[model samples]
Target: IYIPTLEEIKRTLQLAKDYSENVYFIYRIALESGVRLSEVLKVLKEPERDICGNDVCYYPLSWTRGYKGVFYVFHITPLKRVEVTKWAIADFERRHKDAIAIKYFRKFVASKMAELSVPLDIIDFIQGRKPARVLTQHYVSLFGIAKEQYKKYAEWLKG
Candidate 1:
C-alpha cells in the first residue's frame, strides 16, 4: 500500500536525465509502461496491435495467457529489443547501484494512474495484473481504446 506521492514522483522523474543514458532510457520506459523494463521490452520485442481502427497495442504478457473469464480482456506494443534483456538490466543496475529505482517506477505509474483518469481494471490489464473477472466484460471490452487512454496519461508521466 506504499504508493509514491504525486509531487514526490513528479520531482524525482524530472531528474531522470541526471542518471545515465542507459538509466534514462530504462527509467523512462519503466515509468511509461508501469512494468519491469525488461518484461515490457520482452513484449515489445514482438508485440500485437488490436484492430477496430485506431488499432492500438496490447502486450500479451505471455504469463497472463489463459482463463480469460478468470481475469479479464482479450489476450494481448512495439518496443524494440536490440540486446536488452533481464540480465542486461542486471548489469545496468550493477554499474549504477542507485539504478534500482527502475523497478519501483511501476508503482509510480500505478499510483498516478489510479489518481488520474486511467481506469482501475484497465490499469491491471496493462500492468498484467489478474483482476477478478467474469460478467465484468461490459467494460473489459474497452481494451482497444484503453491503449489510447494509457498513452494520454503516459505522456503526463514522461514529464
Candidate 2:
C-alpha cells in the first residue's frame, strides 16, 4: 500500500482533517533540520529511514549508507546549475549587504554544500544561482569531487 508521502501528508494536514497544526509543524521541522529536497523526497519514499536523527548521514563522521544514494544524486543531478547559482548568490550578497536574511540563506546553502562534500568552487557557483553561466567551462570543470570530504556538524550534533 502507498502510505502517505510527506507531501501528501502535508497536503492532508494542510487540509486540517483533524484540526491539528501538523502541516505547519512538519514544515517547521523540515526547515529547522536543514534537510535537502532530495532527502525529504527520499524520506517520503522510504519511511524506514525516518525513524530519528540517528538514521541520517553527516559526512566526515557518522555517514550511514542510506545517505549514499542521496549524495550520489546530489553530485550527479545538479552539476550544470551549481556555478551559476553560486555566482548569482555572491552578486546578490554584494548588492544587498544589509540583508541578514540573505546572509543566512547563503550560510544555509554554503553549509549545506559543505556538509555534503561538494566542491567549494561548485558550491560557490551553485550558490550564485545564475542560468547563463551554468554551462560555462569553469563551472563544468569544477563540477565533480574527487573523494572530497566536508563538514561534520551533523556528527558533532550527534555527539
Candidate 3:
C-alpha cells in the first residue's frame, strides 16, 4: 500500500511523455482515473460505453455485487490500445530499469484525491470499489448524467 509521492508521480508521467503520447495517455489515465491495471488493460481490448445517445465519454467497467444486490456502475474514460499499453509498460520499465507496478497508480490516485478533499466513497466508486451506502450505490447507476458530474473529478486528474 505504498503511494508514490507527487514528485515521483510527476517524474514518471514525464518519463511516459518522453516515451510516446500513447504511453503518456495511459499513465495519465492511471494517475487521474484510479482504475486498476486490469481495468485499464480491458480498455485496450474492448472499450464499451454504458450509455448511448449521450455526448459524454465514458468507459464502462465490470459490475460488482454488494451484500444487498448487484450494481452496474463504475465508468471511466478509455485510455489506449492493448499493444500500446504493453509497449508503454515495457518502455517505462526498460528506461527506468526497475519494477514499476501499474497497480501503484491506483493508490497514487487515491492519495492525490484525498489531498484534494474528495470523499472516500467517490474515490472508491471511481476505482470500481463498492460503496457502503445504498443510496450512494444507486447514485452511481445514472450513467448519462454521471458523465457530466464526473467532469469536476476529471479536472483534478488533469491538474
Ten contiguous residues minimizing lDDT sum, candidate 3: 69-78
Task: List the candidate 3 regions with Cα displacement exceeding 4 Å.
Answer: 48-56, 64-82, 85-91, 97-100, 131-150
How close is every model to the real structure, measured as TM-score?
Answer: 0.58, 0.26, 0.65
**Each prediction's Cα RMSD?**
5.4, 15.8, 4.8
lDDT of 3 by residue, 1-159 (tens): 567877777787787778777676666667656777666666656544434333324565545454442222333444345446465586676777533456788887777667767667666766767533344536546432434445556666545
How many residue pairs clash in all the candidates, one count each? 2, 18, 0
Clashing pairs in 3: none
> Better model by TM-score, 2 or 3?
3
Preferred candidate (TM-score higher): 1 or 2:
1
- Against the hidden true structure, what lDDT does model 2 obtain? 0.33
Better of 2 and 3 by lDDT: 3
| Candidate 2 residue spans exceeding 4 A from truth | 1-39, 49-109, 112-118, 121-151, 156-159
